[PDB]
Amino acid sequence: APRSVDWREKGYVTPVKNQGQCGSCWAFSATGALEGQMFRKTGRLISLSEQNLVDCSGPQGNEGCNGGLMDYAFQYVQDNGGLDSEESYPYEATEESCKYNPKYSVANDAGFVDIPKQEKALMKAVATVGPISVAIDAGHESFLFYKEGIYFEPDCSSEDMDHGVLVVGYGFESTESDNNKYWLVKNSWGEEWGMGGYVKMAKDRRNHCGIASAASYPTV
Numbered sequence: 001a002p003r004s005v006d007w008r009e010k011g012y013v014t015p016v017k018n019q020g021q022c023g024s025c026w027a028f029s030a031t032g033a034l035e036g037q038m039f040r041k042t043g044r045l046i047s048l049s050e051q052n053l054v055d056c057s058g059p060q061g062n063e064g065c066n067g068g069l070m071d072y073a074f075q076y077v078q079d080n081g082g083l084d085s086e087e088s089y090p091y092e093a094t095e096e097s098c099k100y101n102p103k104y105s106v107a108n109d110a111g112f113v114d115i116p117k118q119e120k121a122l123m124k125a126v127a128t129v130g131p132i133s134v135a136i137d138a139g140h141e142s143f144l145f146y147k148e149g150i151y152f153e154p155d156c157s158s159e160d161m162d163h164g165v166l167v168v169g170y171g172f173e174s175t176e177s178d179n180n181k182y183w184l185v186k187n188s189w190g191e192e193w194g195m196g197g198y199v200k201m202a203k204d205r206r207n208h209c210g211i212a213s214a215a216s217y218p219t220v
């Protein structure tokens, strides 16, 4: 596979968004992955509505601001036959009744693909598909204050994830400890967090923070 990949350079990735004080991380991860696959299909980058997923994808198993799963969101889009644009169905950071309107749908999918729970399989998927939805353990103060560098948290769990994010690539940089490899991860806490809203997560350090344990993407 390539040693470095950055799907932002190829135009697959919208700007960083902010979920606010709602547990909708899973909706931002899913829109990010579908935004990439729709651009790969059509050549158009269109920002998609998280509020649409928060309000409407409960029948697929999601729970609004109390959590959800990207795969449940991809299933909703398939079941529903559409997903509205971000401009048409803006984000309010609170759960409300479903207001989906197919006239303003700009995306679709036909299911999704779950990646084997190995970082090597995640690398192959990032290298060949585009941005991938992933779940991580972000429940540590170090993750809140992250500014730059390769994030490594020794108390991070590989099994108990609490936050959905989006792998847009991977790469490397020389470090003190010679643990030089990272996943390039888009968060949804605004661009003031981390590095313009991105974080470099330690790669090939034993599935650090669980980044390869629930990885998937939508099929378009």
Ligand SMILES: *[C@@H](O)CNC(=O)OC(C)(C)C
Pocket (backbone or CB within 6 Å): 022, 023, 024, 025, 026, 066, 067, 068, 069, 070, 135, 136, 161, 162, 163, 164
């Ligand atoms: C993020 O706002 C809420 N966390 C969440 O839904 O975690 C997973 C279920 C692990 C995606």
Ligand code: NA
Pocket (backbone or CB within 6 Å): 021
């Ligand atoms: Na919070």
Ligand code: NA
Pocket (backbone or CB within 6 Å): 060, 075, 079
């Ligand atoms: Na279903």
